[PDB]
Copies of this chain bind each other. A is one copy, B any other.
Amino acid sequence: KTAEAASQLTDGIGGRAYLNSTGAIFVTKIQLPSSIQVSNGTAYIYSGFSGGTESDIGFQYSDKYNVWKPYMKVGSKGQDQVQYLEGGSQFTNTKGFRPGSTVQLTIYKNLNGNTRATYWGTNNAGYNGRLISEISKTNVGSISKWKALATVATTGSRQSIKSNFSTSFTNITIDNKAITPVIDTQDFAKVTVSGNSVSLSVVK
């Protein structure tokens, strides 16, 4: 359950802006929240593309480990079909990107038919490095725009959700062009845009 596609199943709360480019290579720097409270569902911070195929590509928060884990789903294939070509033993399974840190996220919509996300960042132990992840055989063609989201999602009821965290997407570029996002939805969130940066705080 996720409408990141401007249909209706944002089965949760949060904020969303749209980056109006059909480009193929997205890059941003994400300021992960210094702390987060989320008490009924699962917090996510992600980019992705929409309009044609849909993708949720970014981070998913872990209370058990207190880390922002790499997360990606393209079309009908998600988390079980993500391979890790580099950095897997420093940023996956128990590990993830540390709270309060900057991570650089580069997304290739279609790189030889594969969808690739590259993270530069620091894990909980303090290792500073690269994770390369990919879903293969996505063969993404036409895309209409890219997104910038901060959410709490749930399979329970949304009205029991409780949250407070804030994040930032800075130096957003697509095909090496700076793109200014446009606010789309604000559901218990406050979304601020300034040039090719967008800051999102989710509070409920």
* Chain A residues in the interface with B (C-beta under 8 A): 25, 76-77, 79-83, 86-87, 89-90, 93-94, 98, 108, 110-114, 116, 118, 120, 122, 124-130, 136-139, 141, 176
> CA separation between A93 and B89, bound complex, in Å?
19
**With A25-B89, A93-B111, A111-B94 in contact, is A126–B137 under 8 Å at CB?**
yes
**Contact between B93 and A87, CB atoms less than 8 A apart:** no
CB distance from A153 to the nearest CB of B (A): 18
CB distance from A5 to the nearest CB of B (A): 14
Q: What is the total number of copies of this protein in its complex?
A: 4
Tell me which of B77, B98, B138 contacts A126 (CB under 8 A): B138
Q: What are 14 sample pairs from A and B whose C-beta atoms fall under 8 A apart? A: A77-B129, A80-B129, A81-B128, A82-B130, A93-B108, A93-B111, A93-B116, A94-B111, A94-B112, A112-B125, A125-B141, A126-B137, A127-B141, A128-B137
**Contact between A139 and B76, CB atoms less than 8 A apart:** yes
**With A93-B111, A94-B111, A98-B112 in contact, is A86–B79 under 8 Å at CB?**
yes
Residues on the B chain within 8 Å of A76, using CB:
139
Residues on the B chain within 8 Å of A93, using CB:
108, 111, 116, 118
**Contact between B124 and A98, CB atoms less than 8 A apart:** no
> CA separation between A171 and B176, bound complex, in Å?
34
